[PDB]
Amino acid sequence: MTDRYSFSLTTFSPSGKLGQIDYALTAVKQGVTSLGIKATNGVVIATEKKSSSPLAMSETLSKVSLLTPDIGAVYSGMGPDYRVLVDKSRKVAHTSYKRIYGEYPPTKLLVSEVAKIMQEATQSGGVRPFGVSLLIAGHDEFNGFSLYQVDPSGSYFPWKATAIGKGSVAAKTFLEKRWNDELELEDAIHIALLTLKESVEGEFNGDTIELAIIGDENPDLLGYTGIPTDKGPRFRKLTSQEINDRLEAL
Amino acid sequence: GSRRYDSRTTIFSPEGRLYQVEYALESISHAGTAIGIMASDGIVLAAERKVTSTLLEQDTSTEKLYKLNDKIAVAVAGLTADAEILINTARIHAQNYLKTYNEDIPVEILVRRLSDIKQGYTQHGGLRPFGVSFIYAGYDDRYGYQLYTSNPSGNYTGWKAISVGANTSAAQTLLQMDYKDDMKVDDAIELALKTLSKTTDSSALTYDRLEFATIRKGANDGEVYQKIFKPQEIKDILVKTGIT
Amino acid sequence: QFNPYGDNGGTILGIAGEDFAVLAGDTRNITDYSINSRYEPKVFDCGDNIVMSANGFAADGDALVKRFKNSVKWYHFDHNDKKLSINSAARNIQHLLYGKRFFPYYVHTII
Amino acid sequence: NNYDGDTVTFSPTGRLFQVEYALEAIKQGSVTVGLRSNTHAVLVALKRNADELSSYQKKIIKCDEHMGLSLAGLAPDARVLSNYLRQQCNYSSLVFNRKLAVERAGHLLCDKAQKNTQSYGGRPYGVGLLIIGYDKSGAHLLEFQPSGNVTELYGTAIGARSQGAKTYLERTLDTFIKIDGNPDELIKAGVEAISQSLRDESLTVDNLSIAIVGKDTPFTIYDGEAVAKYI
Amino acid sequence: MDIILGIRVQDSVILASSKAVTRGISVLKDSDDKTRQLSPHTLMSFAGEAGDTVQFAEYIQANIQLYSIREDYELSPQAVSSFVRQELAKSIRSRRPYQVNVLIGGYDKKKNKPELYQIDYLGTKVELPYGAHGYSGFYTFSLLDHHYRPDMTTEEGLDLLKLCVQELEKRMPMDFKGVIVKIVDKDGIRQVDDF
Amino acid sequence: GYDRHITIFSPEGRLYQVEYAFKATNQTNINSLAVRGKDCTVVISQKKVPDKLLDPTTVSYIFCISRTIGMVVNGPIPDARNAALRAKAEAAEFRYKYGYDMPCDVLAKRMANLSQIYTQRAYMRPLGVILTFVSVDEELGPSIYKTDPAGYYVGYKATATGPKQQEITTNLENHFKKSKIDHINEESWEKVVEFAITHMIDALGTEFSKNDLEVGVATKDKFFTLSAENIEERLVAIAEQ
Amino acid sequence: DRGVSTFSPEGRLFQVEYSLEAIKLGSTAIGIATKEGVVLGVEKRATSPLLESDSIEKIVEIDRHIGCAMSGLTADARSMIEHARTAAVTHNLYYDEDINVESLTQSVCDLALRFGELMSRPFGVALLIAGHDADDGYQLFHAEPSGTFYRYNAKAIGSGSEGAQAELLNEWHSSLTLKEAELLVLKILKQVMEEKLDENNAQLSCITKQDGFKIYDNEKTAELIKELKEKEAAE
Amino acid sequence: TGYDLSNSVFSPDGRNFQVEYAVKAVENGTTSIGIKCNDGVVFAVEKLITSKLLVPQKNVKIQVVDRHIGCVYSGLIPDGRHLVNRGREEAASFKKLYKTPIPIPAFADRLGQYVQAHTLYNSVRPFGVSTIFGGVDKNGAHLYMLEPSGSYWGYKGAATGKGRQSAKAELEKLVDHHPEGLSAREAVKQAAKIIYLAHEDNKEKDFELEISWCSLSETNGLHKFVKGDLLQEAIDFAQKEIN
Amino acid sequence: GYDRALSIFSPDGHIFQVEYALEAVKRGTCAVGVKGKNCVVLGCERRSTLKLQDTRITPSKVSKIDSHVVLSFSGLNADSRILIEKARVEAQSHRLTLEDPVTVEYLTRYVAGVQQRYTQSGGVRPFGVSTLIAGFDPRDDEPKLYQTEPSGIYSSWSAQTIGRNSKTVREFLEKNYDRKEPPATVEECVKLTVRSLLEVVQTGAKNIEITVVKPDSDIVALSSEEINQYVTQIEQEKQE
Numbered sequence A: 001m002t003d004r005y006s007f008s009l010t011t012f013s014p015s016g017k018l019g020q021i022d023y024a025l026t027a028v029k030q031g032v033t034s035l036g037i038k039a040t041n042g043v044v045i046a047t048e049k050k051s052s053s054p055l056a057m058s059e060t061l062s063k064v065s066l067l068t069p070d071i072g073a074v075y076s077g078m079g080p081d082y083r084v085l086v087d088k089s090r091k092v093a094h095t096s097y098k099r100i101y102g103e104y105p106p107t108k109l110l111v112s113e114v115a116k117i118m119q120e121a122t123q124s125g126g127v128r129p130f131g132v133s134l135l136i137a138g139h140d141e142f143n144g145f146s147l148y149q150v151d152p153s154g155s156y157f158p159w160k161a162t163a164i165g166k167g168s169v170a171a172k173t174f175l176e177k178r179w180n181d182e183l184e185l186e187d188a189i190h191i192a193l194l195t196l197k198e199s200v201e202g203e204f205n206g207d208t209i210e211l212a213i214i215g216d217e218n219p220d221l222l223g224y225t226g227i228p229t230d231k232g233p234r235f236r237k238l239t240s241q242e243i244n245d246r247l248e249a250l
Numbered sequence B: 001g002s003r004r005y006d007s008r009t010t011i012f013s014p015e016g017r018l019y020q021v022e023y024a025l026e027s028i029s030h031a032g033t034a035i036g037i038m039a040s041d042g043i044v045l046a047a048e049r050k051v052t053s054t055l056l057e058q059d060t061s062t063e064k065l066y067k068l069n070d071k072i073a074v075a076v077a078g079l080t081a082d083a084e085i086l087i088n089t090a091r092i093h094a095q096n097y098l099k100t101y102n103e104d105i106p107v108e109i110l111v112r113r114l115s116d117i118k119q120g121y122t123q124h125g126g127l128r129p130f131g132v133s134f135i136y137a138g139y140d141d142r143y144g145y146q147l148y149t150s151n152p153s154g155n156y157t158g159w160k161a162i163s164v165g166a167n168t169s170a171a172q173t174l175l176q177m178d179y180k181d182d183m184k185v186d187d188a189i190e191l192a193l194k195t196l197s198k199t200t201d202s203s204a205l206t207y208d209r210l211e212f213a214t215i216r217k218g219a220n221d222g223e224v225y226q227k228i229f230k231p232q233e234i235k236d237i238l239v240k241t242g243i244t
Numbered sequence C: 001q002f003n004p005y006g007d008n009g010g011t012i013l014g015i016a017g018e019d020f021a022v023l024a025g026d027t028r029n030i031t032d033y034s035i036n037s038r039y040e041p042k043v044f045d046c047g048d049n050i051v052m053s054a055n056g057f058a059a060d061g062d063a064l065v066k067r068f069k070n071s072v073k074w075y076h077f078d079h080n081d082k083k084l085s086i087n088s089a090a091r092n093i094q095h096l097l098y099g100k101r102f103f104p105y106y107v108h109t110i111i
Numbered sequence D: 001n002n003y004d005g006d007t008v009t010f011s012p013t014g015r016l017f018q019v020e021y022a023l024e025a026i027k028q029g030s031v032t033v034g035l036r037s038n039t040h041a042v043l044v045a046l047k048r049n050a051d052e053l054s055s056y057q058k059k060i061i062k063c064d065e066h067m068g069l070s071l072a073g074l075a076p077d078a079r080v081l082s083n084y085l086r087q088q089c090n091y092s093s094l095v096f097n098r099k100l101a102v103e104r105a106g107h108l109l110c111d112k113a114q115k116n117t118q119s120y121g122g123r124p125y126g127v128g129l130l131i132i133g134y135d136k137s138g139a140h141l142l143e144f145q146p147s148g149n150v151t152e153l154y155g156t157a158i159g160a161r162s163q164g165a166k167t168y169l170e171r172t173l174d175t176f177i178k179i180d181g182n183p184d185e186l187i188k189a190g191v192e193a194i195s196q197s198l199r200d201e202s203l204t205v206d207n208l209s210i211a212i213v214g215k216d217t218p219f220t221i222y223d224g225e226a227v228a229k230y231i
Numbered sequence E: 001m002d003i004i005l006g007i008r009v010q011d012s013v014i015l016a017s018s019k020a021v022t023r024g025i026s027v028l029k030d031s032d033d034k035t036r037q038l039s040p041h042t043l044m045s046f047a048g049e050a051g052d053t054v055q056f057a058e059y060i061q062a063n064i065q066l067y068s069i070r071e072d073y074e075l076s077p078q079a080v081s082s083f084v085r086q087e088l089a090k091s092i093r094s095r096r097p098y099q100v101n102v103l104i105g106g107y108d109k110k111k112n113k114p115e116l117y118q119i120d121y122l123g124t125k126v127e128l129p130y131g132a133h134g135y136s137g138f139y140t141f142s143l144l145d146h147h148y149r150p151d152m153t154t155e156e157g158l159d160l161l162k163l164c165v166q167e168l169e170k171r172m173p174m175d176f177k178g179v180i181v182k183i184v185d186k187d188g189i190r191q192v193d194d195f
Numbered sequence F: 001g002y003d004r005h006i007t008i009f010s011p012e013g014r015l016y017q018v019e020y021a022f023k024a025t026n027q028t029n030i031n032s033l034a035v036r037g038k039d040c041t042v043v044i045s046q047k048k049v050p051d052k053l054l055d056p057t058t059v060s061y062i063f064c065i066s067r068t069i070g071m072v073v074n075g076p077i078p079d080a081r082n083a084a085l086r087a088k089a090e091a092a093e094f095r096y097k098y099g100y101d102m103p104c105d106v107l108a109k110r111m112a113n114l115s116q117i118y119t120q121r122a123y124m125r126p127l128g129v130i131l132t133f134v135s136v137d138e139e140l141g142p143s144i145y146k147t148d149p150a151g152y153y154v155g156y157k158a159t160a161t162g163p164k165q166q167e168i169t170t171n172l173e174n175h176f177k178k179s180k181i182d183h184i185n186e187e188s189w190e191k192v193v194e195f196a197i198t199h200m201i202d203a204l205g206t207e208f209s210k211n212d213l214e215v216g217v218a219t220k221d222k223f224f225t226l227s228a229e230n231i232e233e234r235l236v237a238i239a240e241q
Numbered sequence G: 001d002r003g004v005s006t007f008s009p010e011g012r013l014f015q016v017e018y019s020l021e022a023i024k025l026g027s028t029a030i031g032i033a034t035k036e037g038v039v040l041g042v043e044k045r046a047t048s049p050l051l052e053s054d055s056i057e058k059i060v061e062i063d064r065h066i067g068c069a070m071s072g073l074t075a076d077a078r079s080m081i082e083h084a085r086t087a088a089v090t091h092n093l094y095y096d097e098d099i100n101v102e103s104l105t106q107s108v109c110d111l112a113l114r115f116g117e118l119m120s121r122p123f124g125v126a127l128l129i130a131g132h133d134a135d136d137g138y139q140l141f142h143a144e145p146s147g148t149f150y151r152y153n154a155k156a157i158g159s160g161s162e163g164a165q166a167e168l169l170n171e172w173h174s175s176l177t178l179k180e181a182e183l184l185v186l187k188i189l190k191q192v193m194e195e196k197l198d199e200n201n202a203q204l205s206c207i208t209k210q211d212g213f214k215i216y217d218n219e220k221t222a223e224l225i226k227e228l229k230e231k232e233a234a235e
Numbered sequence H: 001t002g003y004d005l006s007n008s009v010f011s012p013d014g015r016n017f018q019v020e021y022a023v024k025a026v027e028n029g030t031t032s033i034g035i036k037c038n039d040g041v042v043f044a045v046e047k048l049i050t051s052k053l054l055v056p057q058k059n060v061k062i063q064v065v066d067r068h069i070g071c072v073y074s075g076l077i078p079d080g081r082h083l084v085n086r087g088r089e090e091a092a093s094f095k096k097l098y099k100t101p102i103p104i105p106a107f108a109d110r111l112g113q114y115v116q117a118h119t120l121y122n123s124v125r126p127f128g129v130s131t132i133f134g135g136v137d138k139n140g141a142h143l144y145m146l147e148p149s150g151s152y153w154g155y156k157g158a159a160t161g162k163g164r165q166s167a168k169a170e171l172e173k174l175v176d177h178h179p180e181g182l183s184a185r186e187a188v189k190q191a192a193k194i195i196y197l198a199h200e201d202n203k204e205k206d207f208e209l210e211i212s213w214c215s216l217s218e219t220n221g222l223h224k225f226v227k228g229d230l231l232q233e234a235i236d237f238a239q240k241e242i243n
Numbered sequence I: 001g002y003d004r005a006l007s008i009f010s011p012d013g014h015i016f017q018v019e020y021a022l023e024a025v026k027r028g029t030c031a032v033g034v035k036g037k038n039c040v041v042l043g044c045e046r047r048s049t050l051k052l053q054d055t056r057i058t059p060s061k062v063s064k065i066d067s068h069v070v071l072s073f074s075g076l077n078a079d080s081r082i083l084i085e086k087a088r089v090e091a092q093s094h095r096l097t098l099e100d101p102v103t104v105e106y107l108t109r110y111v112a113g114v115q116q117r118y119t120q121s122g123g124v125r126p127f128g129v130s131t132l133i134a135g136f137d138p139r140d141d142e143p144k145l146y147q148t149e150p151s152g153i154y155s156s157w158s159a160q161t162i163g164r165n166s167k168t169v170r171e172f173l174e175k176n177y178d179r180k181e182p183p184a185t186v187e188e189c190v191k192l193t194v195r196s197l198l199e200v201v202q203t204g205a206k207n208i209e210i211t212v213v214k215p216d217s218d219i220v221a222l223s224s225e226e227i228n229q230y231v232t233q234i235e236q237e238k239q240e
Ligand SMILES: [Cl-]
Pocket: F109, F110, F113, F114
């Protein structure tokens, strides 16, 4: 018994390709479209909620996840792989940062830790790479707002705006025409909803769309008062009703 | 058992070559070119970003050029994720030396240890090698300014001027042509940019597809300064040499 | 606090002649001021014409004799039934005793 | 064919080929015989040399004062297994002051051999053993196969051409089982048994190996001039 | 063990170390050299627990010599002293700590300056113009506070050292059987034979 | 083609071992169904005992994981019992560590995470089972959560699993289109069990005796299975209407 | 590929059988046992004339009463010799006596099958172990990577073994003197060797009760070579 | 293909061919049965007499676990012994912690989980035995049969080996003809008959019969072997029925 | 831990991984050792497809193991660092316990033992390196030259070469080296070493390295001009 697979399952082919990483990116291509747009005073991340059955309650399945009070994540590819990555990402923000410095990590460094975890699945013994690409949006005092993409290889890139998954090629082109460096958060939400309608086929409402923002601090979502320096989470998930309000003036 | 699925990453070919090392070098030859040039009064590091998109955030970005300590930096060619694993090890190693001896680590010592780690992945453990080649640029009070390169085999060598990644064959011929020993930093800056401009697979070399850095003694008296160039500073240096 | 040692009394005596040797010992076994047994032998035939006694703390004495008897058995198994000479037995017993240098067998041994 | 790479693989008909190949090593081994009465148990073994300049490979090993075995196949594997038996017999004496029952000795060997047939990396033992002994329930003879199967018998034989002696003993069953209180006659029957497995070669003085254990007899081995009596 | 002293002057570092090895009521030896050369321009004297001292000294010597062969280069006195301090700082929280006190005298060839470091068994390092370990300091520090000048010659340093040994031979309870004196300068390490 | 033997990616980004574990799910040829009431959650499954020599009382694919949580399995019994023992242990540890009963959805996530690991780690095969967890959660109310060999999980208004699952699924969809609500608007669990059996009969097109079915019911503070006579009592009530 | 401890269909271990082929490629080693002593001789076989032949060490001391000769992948023998020496000295420490030659040989052979998936492969070298003890007198053993050892009156191993063994079958008798054995090893080595035998490319050694294990000088062997050539011409 | 070369690999059907191959080894073995009765269980097995040289009554195949459970198996005999050794360890630790002797359903799952574990990795081989076992606990009598996959159920009657179909048919008649129940002493007799009837599928070599039982009234809830007068009586009953 | 037996026997009795490691040595740059009456000289080829090199900082081909012993090699450069490091550590460890520096034979025996261990250990491949080890024993003036190879075998040589085209330079040394009269001086020994490399090298410019070891820790490396004088002198005598 015991894990006898102590050798790499991802290796270089004669042409120089890393097969399993390439094949993981192929799995991401098949995945449902998700996107992110960076505004001057915030960031928006969005995706379609592909329901597996109409008897399924799609509210119980969250594709957009809070990592820290100021950082959120969305994905394209394999859902189960994403779920465990969120668990690991939430924990590493504490163990390797909050428990040392008494504050949450800046976006770039949390992203860096998630990338490390995904790189190790590319080299360690007896494991396949993760079959997901992540989009991580967040804010921190000294860097402001930022948006990052993390690929199965472990590579990450900062973006003004981008899309991943099914119809990413068309969605990226749409975002290039609309993005400028003076966009206000509400303008970015509007463009996010427009871009997503192109890749969605069936119903397009607040129950089939999942959307969250990184914006102003929310004191009403803190849960307590009395400490002036603690002002609340910048991450907020838009409600089903809040989405439909914006779909009328579309 | 599991023998069936073992690639045997650390074996010899009948010709006495290491399959996985050779294939990793083949991977690196498709990565963006990076150039290092050593002058008498400093060192230049120049690298080409891999085909950029207009919506990429260029200023808050780092892909090619990384700081190891205040006196040493590296240019990367290969898988970035693999490189960051090695960079963090190198950063820690530098601090271990400083803690032990109360002196900044000599460049070669850091290069040797990082190269020794790479070597290990080719002899034991059954894991794939790191698909990365480094250009090391640094200063110490023994040898002064130094350029090194290491590759997946764990072999390292010293250089006056060198390139890694794509089109090294063409790049090396061009550097060999115009390099001379009494060269100054500002001349080396020009040579680095001119070489990338001629070897690039792109239509034209622009500020948004480059990372640039210098290591000079151009601080105030007998001390060394690392300058990682900002986007606007690359835009200016590209105009100053008349490439754009 | 638990004391792992005790004293079971008794005494032993060995004399050697030209073509013989004797190993004697009394048969009384005690703790404090009480008699445990009037006849409890502590001189043993260990094979290969070797007789042995380990006198002091009887639990350690019995353990040592038990281990040496076993050592003779394995000496035969490993070296083609060769007879264990008295000098070789002595050296072997040294290693048995010194092996517990930092938690000693509380006995005086004679063969 | 495609299912004989290791012990951990079953064939489509439910066979373990590595275990069967281990069984084959026994068939190439020199013949050895075992038989018993109600008072004694006897091993007889034909020893094999490399050439006329070499010694004759010893086939019989003592395990305790009351137990021992003979071997056919890979000799180093017999050394490992006999050593294990020596320890188990010994543990029983030191801890319980009890002579290990010949039946338990069989059960212990079965379970040690089995573990090597169900895990990756290992291999089956490549040797067969005939264990004789005298315990609290009288004389015994066991046959060990490296498949794990252990069997108690009145008499048997393993090795090359063992079928001749095995047939003979099957005929002689009623005679030799009642050779009680007579060692030399029980051996004579065993020496006649092993003679049914000889071809072109006959039993010489540095060729024959005999062992005996019984009611008032410790396990002892006879070689050289001590077996001249029986030729 | 017992007496080890050190004086840094203009151009050299001078180390003096007692020659006696005493166990019980017997002086077993009167010519013991309580020092090891770590590198051509670095010397270390030592005092403390029996066995521990030489074992530690030789362990450090091996490590510095290993470094020298690997890099084809000599570590600075500052670098060597920091390595030694860290080894003792590790040691103090081990199951059985090294009970050894050391002085390190070296000549930095890059700076062209003599350097003297005092390090105790806890790993407490200080750079000093003059140093001592054990009860010696209770006499020599005040003496050197009075007579020492920073610009002295090697000869002046030796006379200053004679004054210290004389005071110790007058007021110390134990017979330490004199000292072996060694000089560390630009030309390396040499021993004064007539002291 | 060793990429089909262990859980590594194929050129088209697929995991064949996971896909084949899904096909093992139907090896028993049994269909299961779960619905929610106002106060309860009912799960039913077919019970096929072909051999006359079997003790029918020991043939079951429904498991009591905790006092509050029940689980029905679609797939071979060895893997089914493996999953059940782990779930029981996990639910027990949760209560000891965190001081309250493990919710149905949290246990589902945990078992789904374990399943995910087998899809990523090579030495462990996936279990060829689909696990349906049911309870009346003290916060969320009546709950149905389902796990598969891919490591996927989600909550359901109602659900079905097995070879003829699609027929049962659409049958349930068509009812909830009509009723316009998320559950069975019924007071007693007895009638919710009756609804479940009625709609399984319609979708599968077969009649059931008392020994052809298996029923588990979750109410506030307990999950329990029904006896043959409890089901017979329920079958009689359907027939007399 | 396939497991390292795999059986062939004929009931043999692949890796053990393949290591036996490596030993057939090795240089010749011969041993002869007499009542006056045991002689060990080897072919040095230098790969080039520039190689200093006296650095070729294929005969080796284990203890004063035990010596050893090797053939095959000779680098593999170092840890076997290291184990043998430790076993011999350790036994003397534990029992204040000399260890029997057979017990030494059995200890070395215990290392042999300690390979698998312990070391990664069997040894690729065979050993001739020669010695003396009080119980069984002068002895010669052939130790293989299978874990098996045979006692021999005489034995040859290496490339010229099957031809040399057939010669040893005819020449050996139970009354050979030590001098007769020395000449016989030289004679048979000269027959199977490629290059012409002399004191530089062959080496002799012996073990006697009185003087223990001794490797002969090149001067001493040269005279035995001259004595051998003269005796063959003399009839 | 190649899906059948490694344990724990799913075929495109969703099958583990290595387990199915282990079942072939079980089908090759001798016949063994189990009969559940009024207040207990009865076990029996066929022992092929390969040669005259086999000592009668001295190669025992039925095994006891704890003091109240009996186990018999068909297939690779060593594999069965490994499973019983584990069963004994499992039963000992249960009694250690909980004081009471291990219940039969509890014991059944201990063996089941252990056998199932040997279908999870390619570094182990599945068990080459089907095991019939059972006994008496606080809730009465229980009979079980466990297969190489780890699958087990409770049984009124059970059979495995080369003559399993013959034995199954004979078991089904007893279940139909005795709805109220079979007595322990009757079940011993019937077990003998069924082994003799199942021997028709293995009739080259003649055989030796071996029976054991656990009964609340007849053996006081403990596992015992059937010997002497009760065994010969059961043999004679069987001999009368074949003629 | 990764366990795979990578070095195993083949049907014909060869260990292919060890034999393929020898091919890596054959690919490496040529290295030669020649010992005189009172010295040993180590010569090494450096390939000239690499211009723009920095020779101050680039790893030298001959390494000091201790102040009295040196090591050169042919094969994989990265592999050789691991052997050199282990050797240097053993050198200091020997001085510590024996209170005497290593003999050249002992240091060679250790390095060869390490190489052998990597031929029958699980999870590792053999070293793609053969070494020449030269020096003088403590308080001894007799020159020592040893050679090791991937299998683990080692031996002493009057003169030897390893690496690419080593068979050509071995041929040269076999007819030009007299055992009865080794190069009597330092000059004679360096010249014979340079001559032997000139059979294979190309230009005698920055392609040849020469290191001279004399008794009592007297080791020095020659510069370009010093070596170039030997090259110039040899060519003028050749035109005859
Ligand atoms: Cl989890």
